[PDB]
Amino acid sequence: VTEEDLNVLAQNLKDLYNSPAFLNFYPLGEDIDIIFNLEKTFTEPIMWKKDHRHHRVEQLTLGSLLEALKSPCLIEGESGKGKSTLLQRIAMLWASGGCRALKGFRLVFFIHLRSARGGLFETLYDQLLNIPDFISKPTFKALLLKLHKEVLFLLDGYNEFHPQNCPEIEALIKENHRFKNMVIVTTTTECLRHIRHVGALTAEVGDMTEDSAKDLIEAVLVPDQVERLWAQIQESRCLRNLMKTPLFVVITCAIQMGRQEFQAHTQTMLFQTFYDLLIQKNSHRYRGGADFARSLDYCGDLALEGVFAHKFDFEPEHGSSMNEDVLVTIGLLCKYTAQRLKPTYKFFHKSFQEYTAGRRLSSLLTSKEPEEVSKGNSYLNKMVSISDITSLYGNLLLYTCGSSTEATRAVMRHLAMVYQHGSLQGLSVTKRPRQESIQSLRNTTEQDVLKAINVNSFVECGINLFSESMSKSDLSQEFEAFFQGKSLYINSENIPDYLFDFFEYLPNCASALDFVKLDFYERATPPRAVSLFFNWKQEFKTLEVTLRDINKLNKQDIKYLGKIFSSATNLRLHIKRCAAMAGRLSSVLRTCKNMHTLMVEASPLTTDDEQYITSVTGLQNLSIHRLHTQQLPGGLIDSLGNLKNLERLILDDIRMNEEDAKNLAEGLRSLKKMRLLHLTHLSDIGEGMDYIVKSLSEESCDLQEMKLVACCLTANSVKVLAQNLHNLIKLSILDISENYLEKDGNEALQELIGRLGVLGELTTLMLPWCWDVHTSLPKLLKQLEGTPGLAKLGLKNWRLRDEEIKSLGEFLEMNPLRDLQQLDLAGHCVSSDGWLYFMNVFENLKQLVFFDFSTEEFLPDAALVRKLSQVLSKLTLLQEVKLTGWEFDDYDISAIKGTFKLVT
Ligand SMILES: Nc1ncnc2c1ncn2[C@@H]1O[C@H](COP(=O)(O)OP(=O)(O)O)[C@@H](O)[C@H]1O
Numbered sequence: 001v002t003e004e005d006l007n008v009l010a011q012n013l014k015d016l017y018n019s020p021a022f023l024n025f026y027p028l029g030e031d032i033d034i035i036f037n038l039e040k041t042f043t044e045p046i047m048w049k050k051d052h053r054h055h056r057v058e059q060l061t062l063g064s065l066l067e068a069l070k071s072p073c074l075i076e077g078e079s080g081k082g083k084s085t086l087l088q089r090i091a092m093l094w095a096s097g098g099c100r101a102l103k104g105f106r107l108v109f110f111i112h113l114r115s116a117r118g119g120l121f122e123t124l125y126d127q128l129l130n131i132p133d134f135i136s137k138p139t140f141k142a143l144l145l146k147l148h149k150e151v152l153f154l155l156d157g158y159n160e161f162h163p164q165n166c167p168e169i170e171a172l173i174k175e176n177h178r179f180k181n182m183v184i185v186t187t188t189t190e191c192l193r194h195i196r197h198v199g200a201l202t203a204e205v206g207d208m209t210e211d212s213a214k215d216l217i218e219a220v221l222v223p224d225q226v227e228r229l230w231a232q233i234q235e236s237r238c239l240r241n242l243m244k245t246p247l248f249v250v251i252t253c254a255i256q257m258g259r260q261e262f263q264a265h266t267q268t269m270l271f272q273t274f275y276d277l278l279i280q281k282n283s284h285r286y287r288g289g290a291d292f293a294r295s296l297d298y299c300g301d302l303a304l305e306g307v308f309a310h311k312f313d314f315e316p317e318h319g320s321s322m323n324e325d326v327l328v329t330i331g332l333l334c335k336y337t338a339q340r341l342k343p344t345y346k347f348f349h350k351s352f353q354e355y356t357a358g359r360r361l362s363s364l365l366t367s368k369e370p371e372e373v374s375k376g377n378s379y380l381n382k383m384v385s386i387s388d389i390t391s392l393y394g395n396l397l398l399y400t401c402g403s404s405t406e407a408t409r410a411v412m413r414h415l416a417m418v419y420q421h422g423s424l425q426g427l428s429v430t431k432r433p434r435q436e437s438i439q440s441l442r443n444t445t446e447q448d449v450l451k452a453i454n455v456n457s458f459v460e461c462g463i464n465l466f467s468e469s470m471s472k473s474d475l476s477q478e479f480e481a482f483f484q485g486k487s488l489y490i491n492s493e494n495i496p497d498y499l500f501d502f503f504e505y506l507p508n509c510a511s512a513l514d515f516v517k518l519d520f521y522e523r524a525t526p527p528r529a530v531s532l533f534f535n536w537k538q539e540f541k542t543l544e545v546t547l548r549d550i551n552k553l554n555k556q557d558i559k560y561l562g563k564i565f566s567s568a569t570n571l572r573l574h575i576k577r578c579a580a581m582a583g584r585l586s587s588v589l590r591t592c593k594n595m596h597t598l599m600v601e602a603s604p605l606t607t608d609d610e611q612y613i614t615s616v617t618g619l620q621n622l623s624i625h626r627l628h629t630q631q632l633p634g635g636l637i638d639s640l641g642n643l644k645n646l647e648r649l650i651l652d653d654i655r656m657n658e659e660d661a662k663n664l665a666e667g668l669r670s671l672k673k674m675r676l677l678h679l680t681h682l683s684d685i686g687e688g689m690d691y692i693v694k695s696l697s698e699e700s701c702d703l704q705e706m707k708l709v710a711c712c713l714t715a716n717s718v719k720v721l722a723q724n725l726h727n728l729i730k731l732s733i734l735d736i737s738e739n740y741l742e743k744d745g746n747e748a749l750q751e752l753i754g755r756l757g758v759l760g761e762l763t764t765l766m767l768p769w770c771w772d773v774h775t776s777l778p779k780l781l782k783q784l785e786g787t788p789g790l791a792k793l794g795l796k797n798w799r800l801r802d803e804e805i806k807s808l809g810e811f812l813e814m815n816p817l818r819d820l821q822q823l824d825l826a827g828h829c830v831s832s833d834g835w836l837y838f839m840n841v842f843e844n845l846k847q848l849v850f851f852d853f854s855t856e857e858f859l860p861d862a863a864l865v866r867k868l869s870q871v872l873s874k875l876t877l878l879q880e881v882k883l884t885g886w887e888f889d890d891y892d893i894s895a896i897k898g899t900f901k902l903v904t
Pocket of ligand 1: 026027028036041042043044045078079080081082083084085086216246247250
C-alpha cells in the first residue's frame with residue numbers, strides 16, 4: 001500500500017470533485033435549461049444544531065459545522081432543502097482547499113446511497129470510477145482502517161437507501177467504531193428515525209431566505225423573467241412560503257420559462273403545473289403510435305412500484321427499454337448519461353417520482369374503472385404500519401391527497417383504520433430512558449413512550465395531508481374519524497402554518513384528540529403560539545404542557561398561560577428548571593377545571609406554591625425534584641394527606657428532618673390510591689424511615705412500585721418491610737438500593753430475602769448493602785429460582801467475590817433469566833480471571849440493556865478486554881455500559897466502543 005498510491009488516489013478524487021462534470025448539474029434534467037454550479041450558483045444556507053428533543057440549539061454555517069464535526073454527523077430537512085448539494089459542496093471545498101476544516105482529510109468520498117450495492121469497495125469503485133486498478137478490496141479496507149479519521153465519507157439520501165442491498169455501508173454508518181472513518185449522512189426529517197440513535201451531531205438545513213431565493217432566481221433566469229416571477233412571488237403568499245425550499249424555487253423557475261402566468265397554491269400544485277406543462281410542451285415529440293395515455297399510465301405505475309419497492313433507479317433489461325425511452329422523449333424521466341452496465345433511468349428528483357406516483361394513485365382511486373380503483377385500494381392496502389406511512393409513504397400521500405379530494409377521502413378513511421405501529425426504533429426523545437417526563441411517569445414501559453411518540457408523528461402526517469388536501473371543512477367527517485383518540489405535538493418555538501389551518505377549519509378534530517402536548521422553551525410568551533391558540537376558540541380533552549428554562553416571568557406571561565391552560569378540561573404540567581415560578585403556581589393555574597399531574601423539577605417553590613399543590617385534591621400524580629427550602633406547617637409534606645386521589649408520588653432531594661419524615665409518614669397513611677412511590681435522596685432524616693415504611697406496608701395496598709434510595713433506610717425499616725411485605729402483593733418493582741444497613745443489617749436483609757416469595761409479579765429487585773451482604777447471595781438465588789421473569793437485578797456494594805461471581809454464574813446457567821434487562825454489580829471484588837469466567841454466561845443474556853461493573857481502581861488483563869469487546873458485540877440491546885475504575889487510557893479503548901454510551 002504505497003504512499004505514492006494513496007496520493008494517486010487522493011489526486012483522482014480531487015480531480016473528480018474539481019471537474020466541470022461534478023461542479024455542474026441539471027437539477028430538473030438535461031431537457032430543461034437550468035444549470036446549477038457548486039461554486040457559482042450556491043448560496044450559503046442556514047443550519048441548525050439539533051437537540052435530542054428536536055429543538056434547535058444553535059445557528060450554524062457549513063464552515064462552522066465542518067469545524068465542529070463529530071461522527072456520525074446527520075444532516076436533515078424536508079425534501080428539496082439542499083442536503084445533497086451540501087454534500088457536493090463539502091466535497092468541492094475539500095478539493096478546492098477552500099476550507100481549512102477539511103484540510104485534515106486525506107480522502108473524501110462522495111456517493112449516492114441509492115446506488116450502494118455489493119460492498120463499500122464495489123460501491124466506491126463503480127460510482128467514482130477513478131479508483132486505481134491495483135488497489136484491492138482487502139488492501140483498501142486495511143487502507144481505510146489505517147487512515148483512521150483522515151477519511152471523510154459523504155453519504156447521500158439514507159431515505160433512498162435500502163440497507164439490505166449493501167450491509168457494509170449500513171455498518172459504516174451504524175457501527176462507526178469498527179471503521180473509525182468519519183461519516184456524514186444525509187436523510188429526510190421523515191426518515192431520520194432510521195439513523196437517529198447513531199448520530200453524534202445532528203444539523204438541519206434551514207429555509208431559504210428571500211435574498212438567497214432571489215439570488216438563485218436571478219442566476220438561472222433572464223432579468224425580465226426574474227422580475228416577472230418575483231412579482232408573482234410577492235403577490236401570492238403560498239408561493240412565498242414555497243420559496244423557502246430551493247428545489248421548489250428551481251421548479252417555479254422552470255415553470256416560468258415555459259409559462260408566463262401561473263397560480264400554484266400548494267407544493268402538489270407546483271408539481272402538477274410542472275407536469276402538465278411538460279406534457280403540453282413535449283407531447284409533440286411522440287410520433288410513434290396510436291398510445292400517449294398508455295405511456296403516462298406506465299410512468300405512474302413505474303413511480304408507484306418504485307416507491308413501494310424502494311427503487312428510485314430503473315433499469316429494464318436491454319432492448320426492453322421502449323416505454324422508458326418514450327418517457328425520456330416526453331421528459332417525465334431521465335436516463336443516466338454516464339456509462340452504466342445496462343440502461344438506467346430516474347426522475348429528476350425523488351420528489352417528482354413521489355408526485356408522479358401520487359398523481360397515479362389518485363387517478364386510480366378516483367377512476368371510473370372498478371379495476372383501477374381496486375388496484376389503487378390495493379396500493380393503499382400495502383400500507384399497514386404507521387412507521388412505514390410517516391417515513392416511506394408520507395410524501396406519496398401528500399401528493400395523492402394534494403391531487404384530488406375524493407382521493408383524500410380514501411386515504412383518510414384508510415389511515416383512520418390503521419392499528420399497527422411498526423418499528424419503534426429511532427423514536428426516543430431522551431437518553432437511555434419515570435420522573436424524566438409525564439410521558440415516563442404516566443407510561444408503564446419504554447415501548448409505551450415510543451408508541452406515544454409514534455402517534456404524535458402519525459397525527460402530524462395527517463395534518464399535513466389535511467393542509468395539502470385544500471378542503472377547508474369539507475372532509476371534517478373523515479378527518480375527525482382519523483384524529484380521534486390520538487395525540488398532537490406542538491412546539492411553541494416552532495409552529496407550522498398547517499397547525500393554524502387545523503385549528504381554524506377543524507376545531508372538532510383538535511377536541512377529538514385524547515391530548516395535545518405543548519412545549520415552551522425559554523419563552524413563556526412565543527407570540528406565534530399565542531396567535532395559534534387565541535385566534536379561534538378551542539376545547540381540549542387534555543393539555544400536556546412542559547415549561548422549559550423559564551427564568552423570567554411577567555404579567556403578560558402569567559395571564560396568557562392562564563388563558564391557554566383554560567382551553568383544556570384536563571391539564572398535565574411539567575415545570576423544568578424554571579426559576580420564574582415563585583408565587584406564580586397559584587396564579588398561572590388560577591383557571592383550571594382539572595390538573596391531572598404535576599411535575600416540578602430543579603425549580604424553587606415558595607410556601608404559597610406548596611400550599612396550592614396540596615390545595616388541589618384531584619391530583620393523581622405528583623413529582624417534585626429538589627426542594628431545598630425548609631418545611632414549615634401548612635407545607636407540602638405536613639399536609640400531604642390532602643390529596644387522597646394521588647396514585648403516584650415522587651419526592652426527590654427534599655430538605656427534611658426526622659420530624660418532617662414522621663409527618664410524611666402520617667401523610668402517606670391517607671393515600672389509599674398509590675400504585676407508585678419514590679422517596680429518593682433524602683438526607684438527615686433520622687430513623688424517619690422506620691415510621692415511613694410502617695405507614696406504607698401496614699395495610700393491604702395497591703402499590704406496584706417502591707423506590708426507597710439514598711433516603712436514610714434503617715435495618716429496622718427493612719425488617720418492617722419484610723414483616724409487612726405480604727400487605728403489598730402487587731409490587732412488581734422494589735428498589736431499596738443505595739442504602740447501608742448499619743446494625744443487624746444482614747439479619748434484616750436475609751429476613752427480607754426470605755419474604756420475597758410473597759411477590760409473584762416482581763420484575764425488579766435492587767438491594768441495599770451491609771456488612772457480610774455477599775453471605776446472603778446463595779439465599780437470594782434460591783428465592784430467585786421462583787422468579788424467572790426478573791427484569792432488573794442489582795446488588796450494589798455487596799462486594800461480590802469470585803465465589804459469589806461463579807455462584808451467580810452457575811445460578812444464571814442453571815436458572816437462566818432470559819428477560820433480565822439490567823444488571824448492577826458495583827463495588828465488587830472480582831478478579832480479571834473472575835470476570836473472564838463470567839463473560840461466558842454474561843454473553844447469553846441478550847435482553848440486557850444496562851450493566852454496571854464499576855469498582856475500585858482496577859486494571860483488566862488484556863485477555864479480559866478482548867472478551868469484553870466480543871461480548872459487547874454479541875449483545876445488540878446495550879443502551880448503557882458503566883465501567884468506572886476500569887483502566888482504559890491508551891490501549892484497549894478503540895474496540896470497546898459501541899452504539900451504546902460508555903462510562904469510564
Ligand atoms: N445553497 C443553495 N443555493 C441555491 N440553490 C440550491 C442550494 N442548495 C440546493 N439548491 C437547489 O435546490 C435543488 C435541490 O437540491 P437537493 O440537494 O437535490 O435537494 P435535497 O436536499 O432534498 O437532496 C438543487 O438542484 C439546487 O438547484
